[PDB]
mmCIF file with all atom_site columns, C-alpha atoms and ligand atoms in Angstrom:
data_model
loop_
_atom_site.group_PDB
_atom_site.id
_atom_site.type_symbol
_atom_site.label_atom_id
_atom_site.label_alt_id
_atom_site.label_comp_id
_atom_site.label_asym_id
_atom_site.label_entity_id
_atom_site.label_seq_id
_atom_site.pdbx_PDB_ins_code
_atom_site.Cartn_x
_atom_site.Cartn_y
_atom_site.Cartn_z
_atom_site.occupancy
_atom_site.B_iso_or_equiv
_atom_site.pdbx_formal_charge
_atom_site.auth_seq_id
_atom_site.auth_comp_id
_atom_site.auth_asym_id
_atom_site.auth_atom_id
_atom_site.pdbx_PDB_model_num
ATOM   1   C  CA  . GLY A 1 1   ? 0.000  0.000  0.000  1.00 0.00 ? 1   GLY A CA  1
ATOM   2   C  CA  . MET A 1 2   ? 0.866  3.694  0.328  1.00 0.00 ? 2   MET A CA  1
ATOM   3   C  CA  . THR A 1 3   ? 3.596  5.087  2.570  1.00 0.00 ? 3   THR A CA  1
ATOM   4   C  CA  . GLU A 1 4   ? 3.704  7.638  5.384  1.00 0.00 ? 4   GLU A CA  1
ATOM   5   C  CA  . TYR A 1 5   ? 6.535  10.199 5.396  1.00 0.00 ? 5   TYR A CA  1
ATOM   6   C  CA  . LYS A 1 6   ? 7.696  12.300 8.360  1.00 0.00 ? 6   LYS A CA  1
ATOM   7   C  CA  . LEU A 1 7   ? 8.365  15.918 7.402  1.00 0.00 ? 7   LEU A CA  1
ATOM   8   C  CA  . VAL A 1 8   ? 9.834  18.419 9.874  1.00 0.00 ? 8   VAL A CA  1
ATOM   9   C  CA  . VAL A 1 9   ? 9.563  22.204 9.426  1.00 0.00 ? 9   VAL A CA  1
ATOM   10  C  CA  . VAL A 1 10  ? 12.461 24.103 11.071 1.00 0.00 ? 10  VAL A CA  1
ATOM   11  C  CA  . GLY A 1 11  ? 13.700 27.681 11.235 1.00 0.00 ? 11  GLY A CA  1
ATOM   12  C  CA  . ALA A 1 12  ? 13.980 30.685 13.513 1.00 0.00 ? 12  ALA A CA  1
ATOM   13  C  CA  . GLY A 1 13  ? 10.972 31.992 15.396 1.00 0.00 ? 13  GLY A CA  1
ATOM   14  C  CA  . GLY A 1 14  ? 8.724  34.201 13.279 1.00 0.00 ? 14  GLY A CA  1
ATOM   15  C  CA  . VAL A 1 15  ? 9.820  32.993 9.822  1.00 0.00 ? 15  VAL A CA  1
ATOM   16  C  CA  . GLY A 1 16  ? 6.377  31.529 9.049  1.00 0.00 ? 16  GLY A CA  1
ATOM   17  C  CA  . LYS A 1 17  ? 6.638  27.789 9.879  1.00 0.00 ? 17  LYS A CA  1
ATOM   18  C  CA  . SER A 1 18  ? 3.112  27.664 11.300 1.00 0.00 ? 18  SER A CA  1
ATOM   19  C  CA  . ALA A 1 19  ? 1.631  29.884 8.580  1.00 0.00 ? 19  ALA A CA  1
ATOM   20  C  CA  . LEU A 1 20  ? 3.132  27.649 5.886  1.00 0.00 ? 20  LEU A CA  1
ATOM   21  C  CA  . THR A 1 21  ? 1.954  24.437 7.540  1.00 0.00 ? 21  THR A CA  1
ATOM   22  C  CA  . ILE A 1 22  ? -1.574 25.700 8.190  1.00 0.00 ? 22  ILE A CA  1
ATOM   23  C  CA  . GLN A 1 23  ? -1.910 26.854 4.565  1.00 0.00 ? 23  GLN A CA  1
ATOM   24  C  CA  . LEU A 1 24  ? -1.071 23.355 3.356  1.00 0.00 ? 24  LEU A CA  1
ATOM   25  C  CA  . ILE A 1 25  ? -3.321 21.621 5.882  1.00 0.00 ? 25  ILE A CA  1
ATOM   26  C  CA  . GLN A 1 26  ? -6.278 24.011 6.174  1.00 0.00 ? 26  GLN A CA  1
ATOM   27  C  CA  . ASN A 1 27  ? -6.005 26.263 3.082  1.00 0.00 ? 27  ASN A CA  1
ATOM   28  C  CA  . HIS A 1 28  ? -6.078 29.624 4.850  1.00 0.00 ? 28  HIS A CA  1
ATOM   29  C  CA  . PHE A 1 29  ? -3.603 32.189 6.158  1.00 0.00 ? 29  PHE A CA  1
ATOM   30  C  CA  . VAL A 1 30  ? -3.456 32.486 9.958  1.00 0.00 ? 30  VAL A CA  1
ATOM   31  C  CA  . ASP A 1 31  ? -2.211 35.897 11.086 1.00 0.00 ? 31  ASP A CA  1
ATOM   32  C  CA  . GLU A 1 32  ? -1.744 35.131 14.804 1.00 0.00 ? 32  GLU A CA  1
ATOM   33  C  CA  . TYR A 1 33  ? -0.762 31.592 15.878 1.00 0.00 ? 33  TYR A CA  1
ATOM   34  C  CA  . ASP A 1 34  ? 1.017  31.219 19.225 1.00 0.00 ? 34  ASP A CA  1
ATOM   35  C  CA  . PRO A 1 35  ? 4.768  30.957 18.467 1.00 0.00 ? 35  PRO A CA  1
ATOM   36  C  CA  . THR A 1 36  ? 5.310  28.541 21.375 1.00 0.00 ? 36  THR A CA  1
ATOM   37  C  CA  . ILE A 1 37  ? 2.957  25.808 20.066 1.00 0.00 ? 37  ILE A CA  1
ATOM   38  C  CA  . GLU A 1 38  ? 4.499  22.734 18.422 1.00 0.00 ? 38  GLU A CA  1
ATOM   39  C  CA  . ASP A 1 39  ? 2.042  20.322 16.798 1.00 0.00 ? 39  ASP A CA  1
ATOM   40  C  CA  . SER A 1 40  ? 1.882  17.754 14.002 1.00 0.00 ? 40  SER A CA  1
ATOM   41  C  CA  . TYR A 1 41  ? -0.622 17.268 11.181 1.00 0.00 ? 41  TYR A CA  1
ATOM   42  C  CA  . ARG A 1 42  ? -1.512 14.530 8.685  1.00 0.00 ? 42  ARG A CA  1
ATOM   43  C  CA  . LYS A 1 43  ? -2.451 15.016 5.033  1.00 0.00 ? 43  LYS A CA  1
ATOM   44  C  CA  . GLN A 1 44  ? -2.884 12.488 2.227  1.00 0.00 ? 44  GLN A CA  1
ATOM   45  C  CA  . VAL A 1 45  ? -1.703 13.636 -1.204 1.00 0.00 ? 45  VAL A CA  1
ATOM   46  C  CA  . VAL A 1 46  ? -0.884 12.178 -4.611 1.00 0.00 ? 46  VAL A CA  1
ATOM   47  C  CA  . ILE A 1 47  ? 2.562  13.101 -5.942 1.00 0.00 ? 47  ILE A CA  1
ATOM   48  C  CA  . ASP A 1 48  ? 3.951  11.796 -9.243 1.00 0.00 ? 48  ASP A CA  1
ATOM   49  C  CA  . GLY A 1 49  ? 1.030  9.373  -9.426 1.00 0.00 ? 49  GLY A CA  1
ATOM   50  C  CA  . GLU A 1 50  ? 1.871  7.848  -6.018 1.00 0.00 ? 50  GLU A CA  1
ATOM   51  C  CA  . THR A 1 51  ? -0.314 8.376  -2.945 1.00 0.00 ? 51  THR A CA  1
ATOM   52  C  CA  . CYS A 1 52  ? 1.380  9.594  0.256  1.00 0.00 ? 52  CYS A CA  1
ATOM   53  C  CA  . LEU A 1 53  ? 0.425  10.282 3.846  1.00 0.00 ? 53  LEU A CA  1
ATOM   54  C  CA  . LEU A 1 54  ? 2.402  13.281 5.115  1.00 0.00 ? 54  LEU A CA  1
ATOM   55  C  CA  . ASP A 1 55  ? 3.044  13.541 8.862  1.00 0.00 ? 55  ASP A CA  1
ATOM   56  C  CA  . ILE A 1 56  ? 4.198  17.153 9.266  1.00 0.00 ? 56  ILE A CA  1
ATOM   57  C  CA  . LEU A 1 57  ? 5.801  18.488 12.469 1.00 0.00 ? 57  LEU A CA  1
ATOM   58  C  CA  . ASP A 1 58  ? 5.599  22.289 12.858 1.00 0.00 ? 58  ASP A CA  1
ATOM   59  C  CA  . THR A 1 59  ? 8.505  22.871 15.251 1.00 0.00 ? 59  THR A CA  1
ATOM   60  C  CA  . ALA A 1 60  ? 8.702  25.729 17.746 1.00 0.00 ? 60  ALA A CA  1
ATOM   61  C  CA  . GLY A 1 61  ? 12.278 25.639 19.094 1.00 0.00 ? 61  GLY A CA  1
ATOM   62  C  CA  . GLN A 1 62  ? 13.679 24.521 22.446 1.00 0.00 ? 62  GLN A CA  1
ATOM   63  C  CA  . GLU A 1 63  ? 12.151 21.398 23.973 1.00 0.00 ? 63  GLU A CA  1
ATOM   64  C  CA  . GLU A 1 64  ? 11.732 20.493 27.651 1.00 0.00 ? 64  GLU A CA  1
ATOM   65  C  CA  . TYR A 1 65  ? 14.710 18.174 27.055 1.00 0.00 ? 65  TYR A CA  1
ATOM   66  C  CA  . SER A 1 66  ? 17.096 18.411 24.106 1.00 0.00 ? 66  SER A CA  1
ATOM   67  C  CA  . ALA A 1 67  ? 16.869 14.608 23.775 1.00 0.00 ? 67  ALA A CA  1
ATOM   68  C  CA  . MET A 1 68  ? 13.364 15.211 22.378 1.00 0.00 ? 68  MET A CA  1
ATOM   69  C  CA  . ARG A 1 69  ? 14.710 17.490 19.649 1.00 0.00 ? 69  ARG A CA  1
ATOM   70  C  CA  . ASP A 1 70  ? 17.239 14.819 18.737 1.00 0.00 ? 70  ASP A CA  1
ATOM   71  C  CA  . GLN A 1 71  ? 14.463 12.231 18.543 1.00 0.00 ? 71  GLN A CA  1
ATOM   72  C  CA  . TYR A 1 72  ? 12.321 14.193 16.093 1.00 0.00 ? 72  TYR A CA  1
ATOM   73  C  CA  . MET A 1 73  ? 15.391 14.861 13.953 1.00 0.00 ? 73  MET A CA  1
ATOM   74  C  CA  . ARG A 1 74  ? 16.253 11.149 13.961 1.00 0.00 ? 74  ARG A CA  1
ATOM   75  C  CA  . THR A 1 75  ? 12.740 10.045 12.951 1.00 0.00 ? 75  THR A CA  1
ATOM   76  C  CA  . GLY A 1 76  ? 12.287 12.927 10.502 1.00 0.00 ? 76  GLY A CA  1
ATOM   77  C  CA  . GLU A 1 77  ? 12.830 11.865 6.900  1.00 0.00 ? 77  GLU A CA  1
ATOM   78  C  CA  . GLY A 1 78  ? 12.966 15.318 5.300  1.00 0.00 ? 78  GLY A CA  1
ATOM   79  C  CA  . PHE A 1 79  ? 13.331 18.880 6.553  1.00 0.00 ? 79  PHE A CA  1
ATOM   80  C  CA  . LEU A 1 80  ? 11.831 22.153 5.350  1.00 0.00 ? 80  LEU A CA  1
ATOM   81  C  CA  . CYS A 1 81  ? 14.466 24.716 6.364  1.00 0.00 ? 81  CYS A CA  1
ATOM   82  C  CA  . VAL A 1 82  ? 12.596 28.034 6.466  1.00 0.00 ? 82  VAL A CA  1
ATOM   83  C  CA  . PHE A 1 83  ? 13.970 31.560 6.679  1.00 0.00 ? 83  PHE A CA  1
ATOM   84  C  CA  . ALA A 1 84  ? 12.297 34.927 6.049  1.00 0.00 ? 84  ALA A CA  1
ATOM   85  C  CA  . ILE A 1 85  ? 13.607 37.059 3.172  1.00 0.00 ? 85  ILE A CA  1
ATOM   86  C  CA  . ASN A 1 86  ? 13.461 40.191 5.356  1.00 0.00 ? 86  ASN A CA  1
ATOM   87  C  CA  . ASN A 1 87  ? 15.456 38.690 8.269  1.00 0.00 ? 87  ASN A CA  1
ATOM   88  C  CA  . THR A 1 88  ? 19.170 38.106 7.644  1.00 0.00 ? 88  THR A CA  1
ATOM   89  C  CA  . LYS A 1 89  ? 19.639 36.444 11.043 1.00 0.00 ? 89  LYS A CA  1
ATOM   90  C  CA  . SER A 1 90  ? 17.077 33.787 10.118 1.00 0.00 ? 90  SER A CA  1
ATOM   91  C  CA  . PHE A 1 91  ? 19.088 33.069 6.947  1.00 0.00 ? 91  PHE A CA  1
ATOM   92  C  CA  . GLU A 1 92  ? 22.382 32.814 8.832  1.00 0.00 ? 92  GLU A CA  1
ATOM   93  C  CA  . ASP A 1 93  ? 20.627 30.386 11.203 1.00 0.00 ? 93  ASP A CA  1
ATOM   94  C  CA  . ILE A 1 94  ? 20.232 27.972 8.260  1.00 0.00 ? 94  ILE A CA  1
ATOM   95  C  CA  . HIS A 1 95  ? 23.951 27.172 8.621  1.00 0.00 ? 95  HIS A CA  1
ATOM   96  C  CA  . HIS A 1 96  ? 23.225 25.933 12.145 1.00 0.00 ? 96  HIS A CA  1
ATOM   97  C  CA  . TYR A 1 97  ? 20.128 23.927 11.184 1.00 0.00 ? 97  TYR A CA  1
ATOM   98  C  CA  . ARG A 1 98  ? 21.974 22.153 8.362  1.00 0.00 ? 98  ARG A CA  1
ATOM   99  C  CA  . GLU A 1 99  ? 24.832 21.287 10.723 1.00 0.00 ? 99  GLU A CA  1
ATOM   100 C  CA  . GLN A 1 100 ? 22.623 20.197 13.626 1.00 0.00 ? 100 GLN A CA  1
ATOM   101 C  CA  . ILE A 1 101 ? 20.350 17.914 11.589 1.00 0.00 ? 101 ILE A CA  1
ATOM   102 C  CA  . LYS A 1 102 ? 23.328 16.202 9.922  1.00 0.00 ? 102 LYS A CA  1
ATOM   103 C  CA  . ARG A 1 103 ? 24.971 15.913 13.337 1.00 0.00 ? 103 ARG A CA  1
ATOM   104 C  CA  . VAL A 1 104 ? 21.963 14.344 15.072 1.00 0.00 ? 104 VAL A CA  1
ATOM   105 C  CA  . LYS A 1 105 ? 21.336 11.909 12.191 1.00 0.00 ? 105 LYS A CA  1
ATOM   106 C  CA  . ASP A 1 106 ? 25.096 11.262 11.734 1.00 0.00 ? 106 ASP A CA  1
ATOM   107 C  CA  . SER A 1 107 ? 24.533 11.508 7.989  1.00 0.00 ? 107 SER A CA  1
ATOM   108 C  CA  . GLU A 1 108 ? 25.863 13.480 5.038  1.00 0.00 ? 108 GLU A CA  1
ATOM   109 C  CA  . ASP A 1 109 ? 22.745 12.789 2.904  1.00 0.00 ? 109 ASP A CA  1
ATOM   110 C  CA  . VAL A 1 110 ? 19.655 14.336 4.537  1.00 0.00 ? 110 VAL A CA  1
ATOM   111 C  CA  . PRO A 1 111 ? 16.654 15.353 2.370  1.00 0.00 ? 111 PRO A CA  1
ATOM   112 C  CA  . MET A 1 112 ? 16.018 19.088 2.739  1.00 0.00 ? 112 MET A CA  1
ATOM   113 C  CA  . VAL A 1 113 ? 14.485 22.021 0.872  1.00 0.00 ? 113 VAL A CA  1
ATOM   114 C  CA  . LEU A 1 114 ? 15.533 25.622 1.569  1.00 0.00 ? 114 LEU A CA  1
ATOM   115 C  CA  . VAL A 1 115 ? 12.500 27.929 1.810  1.00 0.00 ? 115 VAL A CA  1
ATOM   116 C  CA  . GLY A 1 116 ? 12.655 31.708 1.640  1.00 0.00 ? 116 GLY A CA  1
ATOM   117 C  CA  . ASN A 1 117 ? 9.288  32.827 3.017  1.00 0.00 ? 117 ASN A CA  1
ATOM   118 C  CA  . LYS A 1 118 ? 7.479  36.195 3.210  1.00 0.00 ? 118 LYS A CA  1
ATOM   119 C  CA  . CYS A 1 119 ? 8.239  37.100 -0.405 1.00 0.00 ? 119 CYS A CA  1
ATOM   120 C  CA  . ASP A 1 120 ? 5.164  39.386 -0.438 1.00 0.00 ? 120 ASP A CA  1
ATOM   121 C  CA  . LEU A 1 121 ? 6.663  41.750 2.149  1.00 0.00 ? 121 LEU A CA  1
ATOM   122 C  CA  . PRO A 1 122 ? 8.778  44.830 1.361  1.00 0.00 ? 122 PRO A CA  1
ATOM   123 C  CA  . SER A 1 123 ? 12.397 45.622 2.242  1.00 0.00 ? 123 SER A CA  1
ATOM   124 C  CA  . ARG A 1 124 ? 14.013 42.290 1.420  1.00 0.00 ? 124 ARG A CA  1
ATOM   125 C  CA  . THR A 1 125 ? 17.457 41.864 2.993  1.00 0.00 ? 125 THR A CA  1
ATOM   126 C  CA  . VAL A 1 126 ? 18.347 38.345 1.748  1.00 0.00 ? 126 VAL A CA  1
ATOM   127 C  CA  . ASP A 1 127 ? 18.946 38.294 -1.977 1.00 0.00 ? 127 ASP A CA  1
ATOM   128 C  CA  . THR A 1 128 ? 17.899 35.348 -4.107 1.00 0.00 ? 128 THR A CA  1
ATOM   129 C  CA  . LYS A 1 129 ? 21.494 34.788 -5.237 1.00 0.00 ? 129 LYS A CA  1
ATOM   130 C  CA  . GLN A 1 130 ? 22.590 34.364 -1.607 1.00 0.00 ? 130 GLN A CA  1
ATOM   131 C  CA  . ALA A 1 131 ? 19.976 31.676 -1.009 1.00 0.00 ? 131 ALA A CA  1
ATOM   132 C  CA  . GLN A 1 132 ? 20.517 29.980 -4.383 1.00 0.00 ? 132 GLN A CA  1
ATOM   133 C  CA  . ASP A 1 133 ? 24.260 29.786 -3.677 1.00 0.00 ? 133 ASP A CA  1
ATOM   134 C  CA  . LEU A 1 134 ? 23.642 28.229 -0.249 1.00 0.00 ? 134 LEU A CA  1
ATOM   135 C  CA  . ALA A 1 135 ? 21.159 25.617 -1.488 1.00 0.00 ? 135 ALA A CA  1
ATOM   136 C  CA  . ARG A 1 136 ? 23.552 24.765 -4.332 1.00 0.00 ? 136 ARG A CA  1
ATOM   137 C  CA  . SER A 1 137 ? 26.344 24.236 -1.791 1.00 0.00 ? 137 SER A CA  1
ATOM   138 C  CA  . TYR A 1 138 ? 24.074 21.755 0.026  1.00 0.00 ? 138 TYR A CA  1
ATOM   139 C  CA  . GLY A 1 139 ? 22.812 20.042 -3.123 1.00 0.00 ? 139 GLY A CA  1
ATOM   140 C  CA  . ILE A 1 140 ? 19.170 20.837 -2.296 1.00 0.00 ? 140 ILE A CA  1
ATOM   141 C  CA  . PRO A 1 141 ? 16.341 22.824 -3.905 1.00 0.00 ? 141 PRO A CA  1
ATOM   142 C  CA  . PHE A 1 142 ? 15.541 26.433 -3.037 1.00 0.00 ? 142 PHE A CA  1
ATOM   143 C  CA  . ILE A 1 143 ? 11.967 27.757 -3.249 1.00 0.00 ? 143 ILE A CA  1
ATOM   144 C  CA  . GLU A 1 144 ? 10.623 31.221 -2.448 1.00 0.00 ? 144 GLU A CA  1
ATOM   145 C  CA  . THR A 1 145 ? 7.225  31.276 -0.756 1.00 0.00 ? 145 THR A CA  1
ATOM   146 C  CA  . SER A 1 146 ? 4.478  33.432 0.689  1.00 0.00 ? 146 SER A CA  1
ATOM   147 C  CA  . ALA A 1 147 ? 2.139  31.873 3.231  1.00 0.00 ? 147 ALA A CA  1
ATOM   148 C  CA  . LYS A 1 148 ? -0.156 34.869 2.653  1.00 0.00 ? 148 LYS A CA  1
ATOM   149 C  CA  . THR A 1 149 ? -0.650 34.513 -1.129 1.00 0.00 ? 149 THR A CA  1
ATOM   150 C  CA  . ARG A 1 150 ? 0.181  30.757 -1.207 1.00 0.00 ? 150 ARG A CA  1
ATOM   151 C  CA  . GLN A 1 151 ? 3.003  31.357 -3.722 1.00 0.00 ? 151 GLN A CA  1
ATOM   152 C  CA  . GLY A 1 152 ? 5.280  28.315 -3.649 1.00 0.00 ? 152 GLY A CA  1
ATOM   153 C  CA  . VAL A 1 153 ? 3.673  26.642 -0.606 1.00 0.00 ? 153 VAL A CA  1
ATOM   154 C  CA  . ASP A 1 154 ? 2.486  23.429 -2.235 1.00 0.00 ? 154 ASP A CA  1
ATOM   155 C  CA  . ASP A 1 155 ? 5.650  23.393 -4.348 1.00 0.00 ? 155 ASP A CA  1
ATOM   156 C  CA  . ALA A 1 156 ? 7.859  23.479 -1.243 1.00 0.00 ? 156 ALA A CA  1
ATOM   157 C  CA  . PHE A 1 157 ? 6.170  20.564 0.536  1.00 0.00 ? 157 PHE A CA  1
ATOM   158 C  CA  . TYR A 1 158 ? 5.772  18.390 -2.571 1.00 0.00 ? 158 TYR A CA  1
ATOM   159 C  CA  . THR A 1 159 ? 9.387  19.017 -3.629 1.00 0.00 ? 159 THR A CA  1
ATOM   160 C  CA  . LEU A 1 160 ? 10.512 17.854 -0.185 1.00 0.00 ? 160 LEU A CA  1
ATOM   161 C  CA  . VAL A 1 161 ? 8.562  14.619 -0.665 1.00 0.00 ? 161 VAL A CA  1
ATOM   162 C  CA  . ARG A 1 162 ? 10.343 14.103 -3.991 1.00 0.00 ? 162 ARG A CA  1
ATOM   163 C  CA  . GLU A 1 163 ? 13.675 14.670 -2.219 1.00 0.00 ? 163 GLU A CA  1
ATOM   164 C  CA  . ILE A 1 164 ? 12.755 12.058 0.414  1.00 0.00 ? 164 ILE A CA  1
ATOM   165 C  CA  . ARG A 1 165 ? 11.871 9.604  -2.353 1.00 0.00 ? 165 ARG A CA  1
ATOM   166 C  CA  . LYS A 1 166 ? 15.190 10.213 -4.132 1.00 0.00 ? 166 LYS A CA  1
ATOM   167 C  CA  . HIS A 1 167 ? 17.112 9.540  -0.921 1.00 0.00 ? 167 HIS A CA  1
ATOM   168 C  CA  . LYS A 1 168 ? 15.233 6.313  -0.153 1.00 0.00 ? 168 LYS A CA  1
ATOM   169 C  CA  . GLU A 1 169 ? 15.413 4.963  -3.714 1.00 0.00 ? 169 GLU A CA  1
ATOM   170 C  CA  . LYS A 1 170 ? 19.169 5.646  -3.944 1.00 0.00 ? 170 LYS A CA  1
HETATM 171 N  N1  . LIG B 2 .   ? 3.116  39.008 5.103  1.00 0.00 ? 201 LIG B N1  1
HETATM 172 C  C1  . LIG B 2 .   ? 3.450  37.751 5.464  1.00 0.00 ? 201 LIG B C1  1
HETATM 173 N  N2  . LIG B 2 .   ? 3.425  37.465 6.774  1.00 0.00 ? 201 LIG B N2  1
HETATM 174 C  C2  . LIG B 2 .   ? 3.752  36.223 7.176  1.00 0.00 ? 201 LIG B C2  1
HETATM 175 C  C3  . LIG B 2 .   ? 4.125  35.190 6.204  1.00 0.00 ? 201 LIG B C3  1
HETATM 176 N  N3  . LIG B 2 .   ? 4.387  34.076 6.904  1.00 0.00 ? 201 LIG B N3  1
HETATM 177 C  C4  . LIG B 2 .   ? 4.201  34.370 8.214  1.00 0.00 ? 201 LIG B C4  1
HETATM 178 N  N4  . LIG B 2 .   ? 3.804  35.648 8.358  1.00 0.00 ? 201 LIG B N4  1
HETATM 179 C  C5  . LIG B 2 .   ? 3.546  36.345 9.628  1.00 0.00 ? 201 LIG B C5  1
HETATM 180 O  O1  . LIG B 2 .   ? 4.749  36.256 10.389 1.00 0.00 ? 201 LIG B O1  1
HETATM 181 C  C6  . LIG B 2 .   ? 4.412  36.096 11.767 1.00 0.00 ? 201 LIG B C6  1
HETATM 182 C  C7  . LIG B 2 .   ? 5.058  34.809 12.248 1.00 0.00 ? 201 LIG B C7  1
HETATM 183 O  O2  . LIG B 2 .   ? 4.525  33.723 11.498 1.00 0.00 ? 201 LIG B O2  1
HETATM 184 P  P1  . LIG B 2 .   ? 4.431  32.275 12.190 1.00 0.00 ? 201 LIG B P1  1
HETATM 185 O  O3  . LIG B 2 .   ? 3.719  31.317 11.272 1.00 0.00 ? 201 LIG B O3  1
HETATM 186 O  O4  . LIG B 2 .   ? 3.779  32.388 13.545 1.00 0.00 ? 201 LIG B O4  1
HETATM 187 O  O5  . LIG B 2 .   ? 5.999  31.946 12.325 1.00 0.00 ? 201 LIG B O5  1
HETATM 188 P  P2  . LIG B 2 .   ? 6.680  30.735 13.139 1.00 0.00 ? 201 LIG B P2  1
HETATM 189 O  O6  . LIG B 2 .   ? 7.118  31.280 14.483 1.00 0.00 ? 201 LIG B O6  1
HETATM 190 O  O7  . LIG B 2 .   ? 7.872  30.328 12.306 1.00 0.00 ? 201 LIG B O7  1
HETATM 191 O  O8  . LIG B 2 .   ? 5.681  29.612 13.291 1.00 0.00 ? 201 LIG B O8  1
HETATM 192 C  C8  . LIG B 2 .   ? 2.891  36.058 11.868 1.00 0.00 ? 201 LIG B C8  1
HETATM 193 O  O9  . LIG B 2 .   ? 2.357  37.330 12.266 1.00 0.00 ? 201 LIG B O9  1
HETATM 194 C  C9  . LIG B 2 .   ? 2.453  35.717 10.462 1.00 0.00 ? 201 LIG B C9  1
HETATM 195 O  O10 . LIG B 2 .   ? 1.197  36.285 10.103 1.00 0.00 ? 201 LIG B O10 1
HETATM 196 C  C10 . LIG B 2 .   ? 4.131  35.580 4.793  1.00 0.00 ? 201 LIG B C10 1
HETATM 197 O  O11 . LIG B 2 .   ? 4.452  34.762 3.896  1.00 0.00 ? 201 LIG B O11 1
HETATM 198 N  N5  . LIG B 2 .   ? 3.788  36.845 4.530  1.00 0.00 ? 201 LIG B N5  1
HETATM 199 MG MG1 . LIG B 2 .   ? 4.889  28.607 14.898 1.00 0.00 ? 202 LIG B MG1 1
#
């Protein structure tokens, strides 16, 4: 039968992890969602003719115990690494997320997609070239998104599934 995949959405507080996840799951933009809530959601989709069940963890940062962070990174099969295009610190944080996930999984080959969110807002500080160069250095896709307009949202999640499939079918 069909397969379930564990996706994990990571990134600095305020980049739009919850807004992106809720758009995919519930098809609306949520303006105020408590930044300290971490929850998971299921969604069945068909990608490349094959039916999937996505189990998506919307992370929120520090855990009661760091061992719990390590556990969700170990069971996670692919990671949406989200920054906001108007927040340079959130982009620099991607370096740390890439390192930490590889470190916890003790692996050099971890499915990931780099997501630059909030493209509909003014005063961008992270240029597309910067992000394209970084994703290229990791060997992963880069997608620009807006949780408000839905630009790129489905693309980002479905591309991550394709990356998971490529890793498993190696
Ligand atoms: N304009 C705009 N605002 C966004 C976008 N994504 C998130 N936000 C806003 O950014 C703030 C933080 O988003 P949230 O989903 O809570 O970020 P999280 O802490 O990563 O889960 C909220 O006020 C959201 O409405 C976007 O693509 N465009
Ligand atoms: Mg959140």
